[PDB]
Amino acid sequence: HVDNEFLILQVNDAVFPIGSYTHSFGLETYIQQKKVTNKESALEYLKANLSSQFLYTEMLSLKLTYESALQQDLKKILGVEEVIMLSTSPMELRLANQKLGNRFIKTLQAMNELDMGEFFNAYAQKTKDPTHATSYGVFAASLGIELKKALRHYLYAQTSNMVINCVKSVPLSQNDGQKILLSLQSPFNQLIEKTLELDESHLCTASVQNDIKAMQHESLYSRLYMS
Amino acid sequence: HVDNEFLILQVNDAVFPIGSYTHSFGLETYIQQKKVTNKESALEYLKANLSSQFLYTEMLSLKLTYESALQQDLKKILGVEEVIMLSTSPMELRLANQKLGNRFIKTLQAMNELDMGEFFNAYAQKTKDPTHATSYGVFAASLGIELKKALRHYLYAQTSNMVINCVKSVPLSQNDGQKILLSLQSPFNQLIEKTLELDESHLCTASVQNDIKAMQHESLYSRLYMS
Amino acid sequence: QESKLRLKTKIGADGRCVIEDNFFTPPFKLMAPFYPKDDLAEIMLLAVSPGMMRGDAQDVQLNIGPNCKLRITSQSFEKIHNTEDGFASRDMHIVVGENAFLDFAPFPLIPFENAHFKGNTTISLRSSSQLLYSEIIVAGRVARNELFKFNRLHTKISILQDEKPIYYDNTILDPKTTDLNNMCMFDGYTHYLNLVLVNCPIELSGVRECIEESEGVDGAVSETASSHLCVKALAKGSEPLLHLREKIARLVTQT
Amino acid sequence: QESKLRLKTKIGADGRCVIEDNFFTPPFKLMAPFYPKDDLAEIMLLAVSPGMMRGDAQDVQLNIGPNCKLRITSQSFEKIHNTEDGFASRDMHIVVGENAFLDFAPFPLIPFENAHFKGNTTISLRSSSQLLYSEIIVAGRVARNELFKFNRLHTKISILQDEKPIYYDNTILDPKTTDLNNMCMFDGYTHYLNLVLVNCPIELSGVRECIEESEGVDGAVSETASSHLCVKALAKGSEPLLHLREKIARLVTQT
Amino acid sequence: MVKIGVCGPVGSGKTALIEALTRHMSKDYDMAVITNDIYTKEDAEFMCKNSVMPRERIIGVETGGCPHTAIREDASMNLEAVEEMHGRFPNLELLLIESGGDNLSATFNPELADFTIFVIDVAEGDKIPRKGGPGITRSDLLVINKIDLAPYVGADLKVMERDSKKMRGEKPFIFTNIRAKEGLDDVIAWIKRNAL
Amino acid sequence: MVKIGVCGPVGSGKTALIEALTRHMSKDYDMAVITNDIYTKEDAEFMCKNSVMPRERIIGVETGGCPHTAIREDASMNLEAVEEMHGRFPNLELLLIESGGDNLSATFNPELADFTIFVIDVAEGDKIPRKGGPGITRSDLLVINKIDLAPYVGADLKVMERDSKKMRGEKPFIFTNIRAKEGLDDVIAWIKRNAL
Numbered sequence A, B: 001h002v003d004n005e006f007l008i009l010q011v012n013d014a015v016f017p018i019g020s021y022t023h024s025f026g027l028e029t030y031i032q033q034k035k036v037t038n039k040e041s042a043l044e045y046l047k048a049n050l051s052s053q054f055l056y057t058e059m060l061s062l063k064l065t066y067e068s069a070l071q072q073d074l075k076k077i078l079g080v081e082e083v084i085m086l087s088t089s090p091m092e093l094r095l096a097n098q099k100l101g102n103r104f105i106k107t108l109q110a111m112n113e114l115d116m117g118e119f120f121n122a123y124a125q126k127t128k129d130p131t132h133a134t135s136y137g138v139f140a141a142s143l144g145i146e147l148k149k150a151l152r153h154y155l156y157a158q159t160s161n162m163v164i165n166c167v168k169s170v171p172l173s174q175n176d177g178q179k180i181l182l183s184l185q186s187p188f189n190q191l192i193e194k195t196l197e198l199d200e201s202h203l204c205t206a207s208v209q210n211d212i213k214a215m216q217h218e219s220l221y222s223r224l225y226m227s
Numbered sequence C, D: 001q002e003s004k005l006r007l008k009t010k011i012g013a014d015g016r017c018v019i020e021d022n023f024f025t026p027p028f029k030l031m032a033p034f035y036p037k038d039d040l041a042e043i044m045l046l047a048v049s050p051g052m053m054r055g056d057a058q059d060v061q062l063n064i065g066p067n068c069k070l071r072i073t074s075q076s077f078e079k080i081h082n083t084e085d086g087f088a089s090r091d092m093h094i095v096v097g098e099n100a101f102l103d104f105a106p107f108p109l110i111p112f113e114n115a116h117f118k119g120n121t122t123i124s125l126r127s128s129s130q131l132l133y134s135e136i137i138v139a140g141r142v143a144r145n146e147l148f149k150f151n152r153l154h155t156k157i158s159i160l161q162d163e164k165p166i167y168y169d170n171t172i173l174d175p176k177t178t179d180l181n182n183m184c185m186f187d188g189y190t191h192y193l194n195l196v197l198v199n200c201p202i203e204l205s206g207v208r209e210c211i212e213e214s215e216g217v218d219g220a221v222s223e224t225a226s227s228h229l230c231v232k233a234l235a236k237g238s239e240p241l242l243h244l245r246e247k248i249a250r251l252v253t254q255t
Numbered sequence E, F: 001m002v003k004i005g006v007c008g009p010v011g012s013g014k015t016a017l018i019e020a021l022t023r024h025m026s027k028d029y030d031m032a033v034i035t036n037d038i039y040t041k042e043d044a045e046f047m048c049k050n051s052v053m054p055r056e057r058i059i060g061v062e063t064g065g066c067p068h069t070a071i072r073e074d075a076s077m078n079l080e081a082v083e084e085m086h087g088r089f090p091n092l093e094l095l096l097i098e099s100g101g102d103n104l105s106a107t108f109n110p111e112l113a114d115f116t117i118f119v120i121d122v123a124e125g126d127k128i129p130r131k132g133g134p135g136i137t138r139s140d141l142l143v144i145n146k147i148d149l150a151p152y153v154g155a156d157l158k159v160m161e162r163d164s165k166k167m168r169g170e171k172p173f174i175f176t177n178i179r180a181k182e183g184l185d186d187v188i189a190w191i192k193r194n195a196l
Ligand SMILES: Nc1nc2c(ncn2[C@@H]2O[C@H](COP(=O)(O)OP(=O)(O)O)[C@@H](O)[C@H]2O)c(=O)[nH]1
Pocket: E008, E009, E010, E011, E012, E013, E014, E015, E016, E017, E037, E101, E145, E146, E147, E148, E149, E176, E177, E178, E179, E180, F123, F124, F125, F126, F152, F153
């Protein structure tokens, strides 16, 4: 009795219990170093981060495991996940996306009345290093949720959490949070179109200062976030 | 440059700053009186509450102001809002939905780059007692968002907050929260179908024990919630 | 089978609230005033019939003249039988004048299996008027364990003060569309009181106290958008609710 | 225009790391070992040419025999000219044997306007091997204020330990698809160091210290999924990066 | 019109400070309190009596058990009460907003508070100010309270002053005994000067 | 295997209690600590030394500045550390989980904690236990600490015992001085009996 139109809202719900709010993915470093001090610099950070780390690692990896799941190719899915783990150097950024992946799967599995199907269950048994984005990709294909739609909700949900981190920690007025989310709608559509275009040769395309700030996050004198 | 596909996710985001988390709409009373002690009784509470207070007051009122907004009938919209105010007896429940309505409008208006159109702006100037559901109805019609879709997102968002209240206050395991949200999908669809069927003669159909528990919430010895 | 009750009151030549004009047809039986307090008159309303049947309809008209302080107590139970493909109805229009006080409730409703009942109550007040109004609804004949076997029940209230609406109630009970036993509706209780106090000389905390003293009542009081009081209560029998209502009526009529 | 460099080393008859076999064609100029420390041999790699042009391709092959402790330092800058409708490429395969240590980096890259450059680096290690490898990329000719005018740059790294992948890098820089100056990529700096330490006798806190002592470097170190170290750093010139790299290399070769 | 938030751990003297502040200042200033630190109905009362304020000048606002969110990322109901307090008092020059009790990571949304006072006390530890949360570093004024408990708990006030000055830079902090009105004049002076 | 959460306000003695508890009990019991009360790297250290525990037996988990959510509605990272602690210690019989400091509304998700100990102290007030939050009423054991500060702050311990017994019903509470190991044996006795 499962309705995909509701299920997609449920797994992308900000309160869906994977613990996203404990992670800044390096943003906390940019803040303590006074590179994100206000609405305009926050929007700059977000555009740059989404166009680099998020597009080539998170979004593209989701598309890849979706497509492989459709052909029930478990081997290619685990290969994508190995690439991501061996390519993501900053430890707190690597561990963040892995822990979120663990939580995502454990939560789906905790719901006994949701039948994910033989392939997803097989995936869930074998996966060594799932991330939130790869496991979500397999989830959406398994349930016949349309790729473009799956991407749209996932992108919005992850971005909202980054914007809220900015609101909490800069801090910014909660209204600025909403202006930023509105400004990002053209970029969101460009990102989705780009994701559909990109082949797997672009997977895990390197960022530079983003990685460095994610590593510097380990040594902060005082901090609130796990990454 | 506004995309309604994103905007609808944005205004229904759990972190969209209207303050829903500070309100239990009477649930806190049910909990301290040991009527909701676990997953099964919580699901009972939710089914009963959604089929009474939420269906006939919240959801139906949203459909009504949507339809009136399409014809640009401001008078009928303010009439629906007057009926709700004069019909909702428990004070904390009445004030909760009003405060949430204020916050919802003030937040849309704070975003200067969103053009709501001449009619919504006229609405926002005249409205005396908007609630979250009525103002949302006018919002969706003004932007050409399809009714059935508008209802789906609104229903999910408000219900997730009630389930989280159960998780925090009973308490329940966060997994139980998710099983509940999954169990509610058939009832969600019934509720939407029902909302489309119902005419305005059903508006503010009385509940009984729900109202009484909402009133008893005022005198609790110690409490965490505003309603 | 159209039953009527019409009543008009005035301050009489002796300074007491008196019946100026009346009329009724069965089932209604109206009795003559008695005087518990100085300014307080009490008139009993009774019913002589074995209930309402398919096609039955009642029309009540109350007019309470200026300066009248009146208590109308309905001493019977209104039973709705199986109405088949028809229904039974109750319409009431109530008018309260300047500086007048009215304490009134219709007979408690006991719907039988497949009973279909509709009612409409409109009340006009003046800014200086005072009102205590209430309604009780029962689940069925609890004696024989008939709970929520009726067809459908729909009752409405509108209260206007100088032509301006200050309160509404819309009660629709249909056991086919919902389980009326659920924890948001009757919640295992069989009897429901809904009560309004408009412009009365009583504080919310005083009403709250009466409710707390009442045994076998799960009930509460709260302030309406128009700054008046509303009381709702559930019970396993009519007596705890009727007694509670007496205590509240007493708190207002001693002031 | 296929340039080659092939190098194979072994522990020599005197107990020192020596060249067993080599070969090269221009631009490459290979020099003979010198011995700063007892076990530490150093071999300089130089380049005699004005840069790479459309169609140019390099192939490098390194084989570091068992027990060799070797430092290969590339003392030139690799300049990529306008390649028009073609591209220049650099392929490197590196093999490190048992109980062997290799310190190596290719020439820093300076892409000119409309340069198109591709490179691929594969490194095979044994569980007992030790490795320090790095790459530097610069924005353009900073002297003439040419920043990110190249066509496209794509370089890749794969490091395997006993046939099992332990590290990857995929670097794609295309000024047409993004502004490489943004705060997530070059962030106003013109020079980028990426460096890996595999199985080296050094603690993360030690590496973190060198980075802090380095002036004019925005940089950092972290532990990889395979438990090795990765360092990334940005600068306004090659010298602060090259110097930082020297300090790190020193920390491992004194142990 | 000028909003000043007061946060700090439970039992640190946030309420005592606000009561003693309005006792002194309400004479010369038009002012009110919004407070999230309430459980029982008898809480809001006790604050009115101790602060010598009319009940209409103090509004309690529940947090749903989320005292951090209530002053920070969704401040909605607190902001609703602010707009309410402006409806009651058109000439209002000063508004004190008290949190529901929190930890060193507590901050106010800029929409809610124009300035922030963080309140810790000596018996929590002398190593508290070097832990360095946003409550220590970001707040416009820090208040170290219950200094009279120092010799009994073994708290080194040179240590606390050293570490505080280090963390806040030139952002002022004030040592305090609220029961003895000690330093209370300093705090009052700060508000008049800084927030005006 | 048996998880016990420890919450309470900042400075109330949560850490002191956990350190003094492991000092005594780790001898006869296989046990570990997860803690959300950390800011600086030098926090997690100081707990290992004072508690006489190896570093692998204490995991710090950051809350993102949301210490209530971290033990309650989304406990995800704490739950992740629990499963980690079970990977390190297959024979583990007791796991102490310390919150990031909080207020009287603090509760643990049942998935996270099997039992809960709430810690307040005398200097916060003697009217604290009658405020009646879920920390006072719901917790399996309440600890009232720093009783030695009582005469100096004017705290009436008959009042505190009266009000506590009223609020908790038959749910046990224990008066305590942790520095003096006073009542510490009672707490230890409770854990052995109740949580086993
Ligand atoms: N010894 C001492 N006690 C104080 C001082 N200031 C406040 N207190 C007491 O500390 C306790 C907690 O104060 P309270 O206002 O309730 O703290 P809050 O929880 O932040 O609002 C109360 O019993 C106060 O009387 C002080 O300077 N010295």
